[PDB]
Amino acid sequence: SMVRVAINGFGRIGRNFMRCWLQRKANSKLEIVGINDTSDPRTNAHLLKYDSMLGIFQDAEITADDDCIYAGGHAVKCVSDRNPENLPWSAWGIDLVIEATGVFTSREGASKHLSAGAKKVLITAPGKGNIPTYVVGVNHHTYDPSEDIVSNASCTTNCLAPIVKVLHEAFGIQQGMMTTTHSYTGDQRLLDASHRDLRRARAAAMNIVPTSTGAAKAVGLVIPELQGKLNGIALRVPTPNVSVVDFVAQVEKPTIAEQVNQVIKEASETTMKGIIHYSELELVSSDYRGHNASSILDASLTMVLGGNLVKVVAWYDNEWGYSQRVLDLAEHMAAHWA
Amino acid sequence: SMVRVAINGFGRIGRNFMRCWLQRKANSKLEIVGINDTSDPRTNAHLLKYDSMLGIFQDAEITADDDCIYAGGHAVKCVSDRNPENLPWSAWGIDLVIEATGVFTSREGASKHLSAGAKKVLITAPGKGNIPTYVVGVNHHTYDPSEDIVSNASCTTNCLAPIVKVLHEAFGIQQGMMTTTHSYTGDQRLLDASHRDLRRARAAAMNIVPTSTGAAKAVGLVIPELQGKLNGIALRVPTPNVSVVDFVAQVEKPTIAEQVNQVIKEASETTMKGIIHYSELELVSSDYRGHNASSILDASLTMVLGGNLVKVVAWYDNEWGYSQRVLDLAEHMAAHWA
Amino acid sequence: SMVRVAINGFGRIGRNFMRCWLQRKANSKLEIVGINDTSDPRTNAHLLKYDSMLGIFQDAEITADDDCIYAGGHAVKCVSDRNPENLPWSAWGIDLVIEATGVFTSREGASKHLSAGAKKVLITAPGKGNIPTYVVGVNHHTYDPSEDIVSNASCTTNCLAPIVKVLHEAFGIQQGMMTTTHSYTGDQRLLDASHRDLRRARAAAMNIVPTSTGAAKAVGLVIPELQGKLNGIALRVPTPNVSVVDFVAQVEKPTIAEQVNQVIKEASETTMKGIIHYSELELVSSDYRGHNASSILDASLTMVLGGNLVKVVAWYDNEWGYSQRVLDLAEHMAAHWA
Amino acid sequence: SMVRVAINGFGRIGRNFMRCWLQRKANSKLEIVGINDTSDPRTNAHLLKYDSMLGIFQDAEITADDDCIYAGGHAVKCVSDRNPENLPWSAWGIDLVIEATGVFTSREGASKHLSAGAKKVLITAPGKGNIPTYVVGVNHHTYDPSEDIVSNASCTTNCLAPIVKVLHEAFGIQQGMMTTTHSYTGDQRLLDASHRDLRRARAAAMNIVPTSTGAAKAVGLVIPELQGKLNGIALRVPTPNVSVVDFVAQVEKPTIAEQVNQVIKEASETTMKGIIHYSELELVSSDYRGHNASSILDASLTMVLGGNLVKVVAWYDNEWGYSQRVLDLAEHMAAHWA
Amino acid sequence: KTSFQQYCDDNPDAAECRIYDD
Amino acid sequence: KTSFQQYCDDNPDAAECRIYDD
Amino acid sequence: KTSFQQYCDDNPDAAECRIYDD
Amino acid sequence: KTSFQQYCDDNPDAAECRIYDD
Ligand SMILES: NC(=O)c1ccc[n+]([C@@H]2O[C@H](COP(=O)([O-])OP(=O)(O)OC[C@H]3O[C@@H](n4cnc5c(N)ncnc54)[C@H](O)[C@@H]3O)[C@@H](O)[C@H]2O)c1
Ligand SMILES: NC(=O)c1ccc[n+]([C@@H]2O[C@H](COP(=O)([O-])OP(=O)(O)OC[C@H]3O[C@@H](n4cnc5c(N)ncnc54)[C@H](O)[C@@H]3O)[C@@H](O)[C@H]2O)c1
Ligand SMILES: NC(=O)c1ccc[n+]([C@@H]2O[C@H](COP(=O)([O-])OP(=O)(O)OC[C@H]3O[C@@H](n4cnc5c(N)ncnc54)[C@H](O)[C@@H]3O)[C@@H](O)[C@H]2O)c1
Ligand SMILES: NC(=O)c1ccc[n+]([C@@H]2O[C@H](COP(=O)([O-])OP(=O)(O)OC[C@H]3O[C@@H](n4cnc5c(N)ncnc54)[C@H](O)[C@@H]3O)[C@@H](O)[C@H]2O)c1
Asked: N or C: lower Cβ tally within 10 Å for chain H?
């Protein structure tokens, strides 16, 4: 029957994920039955309904009492314990935890959910250590049903990996560099303030803020041929959502911009349909709010030099697109459940 | 003998205060000898030097080691304990604690510094309960050197109270309403996120965010004749510093805009010099960064209806101007120290 | 027979108005048949479809050729001439011009459309001089179908006037002061740059920017009893849409916050339904994007001092809510058209 | 004696240039004697003194009357004519025009200043057509004293070209791709509005906005060996000043990140001193406001893959740093005057 | 009357001239 | 008393708890 | 030329026309 | 460990500690 889901961490990803599921629940093998978060049901319901990025939730009524939130009559039990070992996963019959706190990304940390009674954990972030990592559309069919802790990688990896896979199969990627010009996220401070990362310490809406990223190296987890062949950085900028990846690859088969675009367009219509969208329109970041693709190639920006140096640029809604992929991965696990 | 100062909470106010003192150090009766904060000395030194609002500190070299920060070779010992009862105030011979964390604003909370050995506490915020409250230029000469815990009120109260005092003495304030259009502060979330206050939960750089405020009622603490006669609200907006007070008062003596402006101009040249600045220029918020006045009257905006309904508008640098007043109050306490 | 409409100035209001009409087209007595704007049809169609504030237009396909834009196959002829006397209004059989350029707000300016052949002009802004001014829900039933030039006032007047009417009828307004904390608009410069108004010259997304406003005085045009009894100012802040009015009034009948809220709530359920919305929720500006009311009272912010000094605060979507009112006024004119 | 200078276009670059000169005028061969701009002296003086990015001008008093602006007693004549052929360059004895309007970048357009009486024009932008282009520190010593119209290239070219020259001489650049994550500029609209470029049409402080750029190709003008070997794009983001270039090069001599950094550091201390600054600090965009270097290498971000694929990242203050270089070029022309 | 004043009379929609009564 | 209320009593400086009276 | 193209030739500094190569 | 390092081990979700790999 239904796989019973708890969300741990009802933040940007936890709430985007909930909204994704509420829109797709008619065809779902998942039932969201529980939420754990630092705050109480009243606060959870308020923030699920009223969202500065997504707008007011339209599809169903959202209410709360002392114990639960309610989405169109569907009751979701709520708890507030920052130590997952204490969570009521056995009592609630939780099968799958969506680990969206940002802090239980190692196997040791995520396994606390298993001790509490859950059967599997899906981490909405890169794993730390030996955690199987999936990008839907790239390697999710390799899912091993015996795995108990998995990672859906990062938003940037979900945007970059599909494009890299298409380029690698068509031209052969030898090396590649990435920069994501990325919306600020909740790990950055609003005004300059203490942080163990001195750049994340700085006022996020006032600054371009470089941060290291594992996203390019993590493409090598989901495309094993490319392990060690990619690197890159992030520049966080003063937009609250929607990001863009700039990828410069050294390829084996010499090509030109028109052919790179043709290959990606063909993939977007066939093997990568629903994962890569191909755009020839002159749009800007706001226009990609709510896009369901992992990667939207901005075809007007493609360029090639000397046959082998290829630049492609792709947009992604780092909150909503990524959460659609979290849901896709969770549905895949539910359909291959053991 | 210098009054030995420790800063508790090395945040926006703690670091603005430190910079204010470093610039005014030659004339000071204070010596800042210690900092307690959640972070370590190297982070504190970095944030003291590199400030998104104030720029790179120009006047002296700032360095750090495991134990201290150094400003022009002058050592400031650092500790990191969120429980003030554990702080080394007796061991460091601390006379005055600048309580700038935002969380020890009650007598019970601030008194933890006294238990740890400090002789006096100056809270950089409104006090909760029976804490004497001072606005420099309004009532700071009523300070009693036997008081062990004092409050310097809020930035907004420091902007409003001097204006109210001048208007009350000239025209007789019967009732008054305030709105501060205020830069966002560190109690608001960067992106929508859990908060016990549902409006502070919302993305600060994306929204106009109302909050209740005690700032207008607090003017009645420093001008006791007006107890209960003032109220108002705050609207936080997407600027990182500099704020503006809009004050609408019912007055006893009929007047007109020209007279209101002249009275404030006269006070700014005499009894309120250095506290109120009078401006006839058509400026905007950025122009008031670093202004040393508590209140800058924007004379072009003054209006009166029916003789008795008066509107005035005043700018304030809520970080720097307020920190100048914290330092002024501390220097006053030092001048009267037994 | 449909009233044939041309839009002069396809800007924020012109395009919001077009979208409002496209959504309300089935019940409309208006047919939008022409656009005059500085730009060409392909640019107009692109900006109508792709909007940073409203999102991608969902209801119908938008296309363009050299001569027209098409919304669901319905053709809107386009021209580009900054001199209204040259416009093809007789040739296109135009009944009503929506004057949305910001520059033909005097009778002499707006009358250029009449010279070009249009039968009536609705100015989407305060009129200059002896132009009849209407606020839907306040005085639009006084519209005289013989009038050839009318004004729909400003967004701020449309927010303030319904509230003032309700408060005046319940308590008797003697005098009142307003401040609108307003999103930036297209009359301000992006970076500091030449402007005949030294405050509009300043970088709009970096500053709180005061401007004078006639919006409060204009309430006396639509509530003639209050002529000369209202004044106020504007503070433009770094949000791109949604604004808030703060109104402080001296009233004759003593009251308290609870009664003020109840009177406005009652009006919002009856005589002001669809014009005033009453909210007890703790929301922020983004939550009011797309709200159809002229005024949303934020009940949590209401306060009263001494029985007779009343503060109320109301939100408004200055682009979309105002454009809904422009459309309401135009439909009213059409319903009474000879 | 002194080369007499007029500024045509008193915008961001025109005013930054003026402030650069006012700080450096004690050692200058230039005398700024005239300004032409759309606006009047009052507006010019106000915006020269009050700057949202630079703060209030500190070094000298700035005043104006009907005819001139005054900077520390130095009178600067003012005129307002958008047709340069009418300008009083003969009457004022103008030797050099700083062409900072953005609209006279072809030889035909810039030559209108020569017809009006000026002897030379320095365009503060890439030239259109056959205009000699200089980047100080890269090829300014090649200045031919007989040239009458020259270009100082763009801000991005001034940042990229010095780094490219150092990398080319050390490793041999075969191909290279650039993306500048760039602060918004005055060619973009504040809210979505008509523009012949559909991406520049979109709300600048709300969006990441791709634009094509000639900056990488223009490096081939100042380093002729590299003509045709570079390409790239711009992403405009919601910061008002300070930009960063990301450059990914294919090089001939295989290397590693430590060696790339060592080469650039050595150049920054010798051949490129004052042009390239080498930073190992973890800073953000605000920290580079007012930096005098054309390029600040962020050494922590350098990476190399496979020996030949090199990524470097460099900051630049696109207003102030570029204006310092305009002044440097003007001084070089004045010292080689014919 | 100044050139700037004439410019804004002739081009009230120009960026240096727009006054929207918000 | 709820867990969230206890959390903010124990950690008034936590991001979910800060109330600065501006 | 369209009216828009002519307008940008006559007023390259107009808000609808500015192209700065950043 | 410094007090700051210990604090981030105990409270990895604290504002001074969060590291999201974007
Ligand atoms: N925002 C994005 O664009 C994005 C995209 C992909 C992945 N991610 C990843 O998803 C994770 C969450 O990111 P986010 O943007 O939603 O962050 P967030 O800060 O908005 O949400 C985190 C939520 O978890 C709660 N929380 C923290 N510690 C907890 C604990 N011990 N127990 C229970 N609840 C706890 C917080 O109160 C908050 O509600 C991070 O790993 C991040 O890297 C984020
Ligand atoms: N920012 C302003 O405009 C302004 C103006 C006037 C008054 N204030 C008041 O000053 C206080 C601080 O405000 P801020 O803007 O500097 O905030 P902030 O968040 O920038 O600084 C608070 C600092 O205290 C530290 N801290 C928190 N709890 C602590 C504890 N238990 N022990 C030691 N350090 C701790 C934090 O890590 C941070 O460094 C608040 O009461 C605020 O209302 C602020
Ligand atoms: N934006 C708001 O919140 C708002 C609300 C209420 C009323 N208004 C009023 O509506 C009017 C327009 O405001 P907006 O925000 O849409 O401004 P806008 O700058 O977005 O739109 C003005 C449009 O008119 C065009 N235009 C200018 N001069 C023209 C001419 N001579 N001929 C043809 N087209 C011309 C411009 O190119 C632009 O497309 C102003 O009077 C404004 O005060 C605006
Ligand atoms: N801002 C930057 O970062 C930067 C950096 C390097 C180069 N540039 C280049 O410098 C030039 C100006 O850029 P800006 O940012 O200073 O733009 P801006 O819009 O701030 O300034 C242009 C100035 O010229 C005036 N002007 C326009 N047309 C005119 C005419 N016909 N006659 C007289 N005055 C006129 C305008 O009123 C304005 O004052 C552009 O070519 C731009 O590409 C800009």
From this structure: N
